[PDB]
Amino acid sequence: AYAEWIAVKVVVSKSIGTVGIRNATLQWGKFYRYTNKDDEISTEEVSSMNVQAGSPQWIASCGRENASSGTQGSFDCYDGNTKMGTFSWDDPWKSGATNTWSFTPASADYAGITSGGNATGTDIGEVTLTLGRFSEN
């Protein structure tokens, strides 16, 4: 249902400048143009986004309308040709089931720190993903 949704705000550090969103996939649900759940967009459109430092953009997904199912999927973040990592989520419809999400970095050269999100209830809601380039201290 539309009650199951996530919207990921992609924040790119000047340590990277531009992040390519690629390889988006869904096991359940659809992508949409935040904030209008009726405005469905293709996986290819999501997988063509370039996010610039200073101007965050949103990747949003919800369950299919009136269905007893939610949204589950992922997308990859790239710094040019170099994979930074993968953001994944699982927002089930079933009442009482835990909602989950994570960024998994490809290496210690990049980090994706998340803030926000509901582990319980219908929707994950808005989550911020802050991406940067890092070196060991």
Residue numbers in the entry: 2 to 138
Quote from the publication.
In this work, we show for the first time that the bacterial aegerolysin RahU from P. aeruginosa interacts specifically with CPE. The crystal structures of RahU revealed the conserved aegerolysin fold as well as a ligand binding cavity, harbouring a Tris molecule from the crystallization solution.
Recombinant RahU protein was expressed using E. coli expression system, purified and subjected to crystallization trials. The crystal structure of the apo-RahU was determined at 1.27 Å resolution. Some of these residues, such as Val20, Ile22, Ile60, Thr72, Phe76, Phe88, Trp90, Asn100 and Trp102, are positioned in the mainly hydrophobic core to maintain the integrity of β-sandwich architecture. However, a majority of the conserved non-alanine and non-glycine residues, including Trp6, Ser16, Asn24, Trp29, Lys31, Lys38, Asp39, Glu41, Ser43, Arg65, Asp77, Asp80, Asp91, Pro93, Trp94, Thr99, Thr101, Ser116, Asn119 and Thr129, is solvent-exposed and/or positioned in the loop areas, possibly providing a uniform environment to aid in the membrane lipid recognition step.
